[PDB]
Design a protein around this nucleic acid. Structure first.
Length: 183
RNA sequence: UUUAUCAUUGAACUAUAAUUGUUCAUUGAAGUCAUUGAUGCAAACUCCUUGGUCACACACACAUACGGCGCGGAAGGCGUG
């Protein structure tokens, strides 16, 4: 069923300690929009539940860095589902204008970055040949949302992070801007 | 468990406040590597060097507590010439 509250409760029910937060946890998702306004509307509707400390948005001055810190395993599912389905529904189904409902025929596709010093010991695959110097890129392909919620749970249940610096985010911004400036 | 710069300028910002606090960018200055590090605690495992792997024994002892009553070797203490 293509409603993310229903899947979020579905995965709160059954996933063996999905509430617990992962220590040292950092996810950076750089996204692009051609409308600033509707994207800021989505971030407001998102921040009403996500909370300011766990999820942040930094605009480069269109590119917006969406950063998750200290997220729960359940929390990452909610955020990445809303943002990837928004990024898709801008092109696919523009009229519907609901944030928490993902219309049929949307397959979630995107990429996120984790810090390089994670140890992992499907639908989310890590990439060979990653352009950013100190970060690892992961790609999610063709997930319905029910399948993507499940796959994020099986992915961040395993992975385990370690000891990033305080200003690691500024470093990611600087390096990402250098590569796209070079191209 | 705990750590990862300093100064200048602009912008928003909280405020009893010159704007003390918070975030973003800019110029200059240094800057051991590390963060899979460092520090605290503890355990298992694997492996190296070293030795009289000597002789006679497989033995019922002992209150003054224990024949120090086999041959060597190592190291000291003390005595004599």
């Amino acid at each position: 069923s293509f409603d993310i509250w229903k899947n979020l409760d579905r995965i709160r029910s059954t996933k063996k300690n999905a509430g617990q937060f992962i220590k040292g946890s950092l996810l950076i998702l750089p996204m692009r929009t051609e409308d600033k306004q509707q994207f800021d509307e989505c971030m407001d509707e998102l921040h009403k539940y996500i909370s300011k400390d766990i999820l942040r948005c930094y605009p480069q001055k269109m590119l917006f860095y969406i950063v998750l810190k200290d997220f729960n395993i359940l929390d990452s599912c909610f955020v990445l589902s809303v943002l990837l389905a928004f990024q898709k529904r801008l092109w696919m189904a523009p009229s519907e204008k609901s944030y928490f409902r993902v219309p049929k025929n949307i397959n979630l596709t995107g990429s996120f970055y984790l810090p390089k010093n994670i140890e992992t010991g499907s639908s989310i695959v890590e990439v060979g040949f990653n352009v950013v110097p100190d970060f690892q890129q992961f790609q999610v392909k063709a997930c319905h949302v029910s399948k993507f919620m499940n796959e994020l749970s099986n992915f961040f249940s395993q992975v385990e992070f370690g000891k990033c610096e305080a200003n690691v985010i500024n470093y990611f911004k600087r390096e990402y801007n250098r590569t796209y400036s070079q191209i």
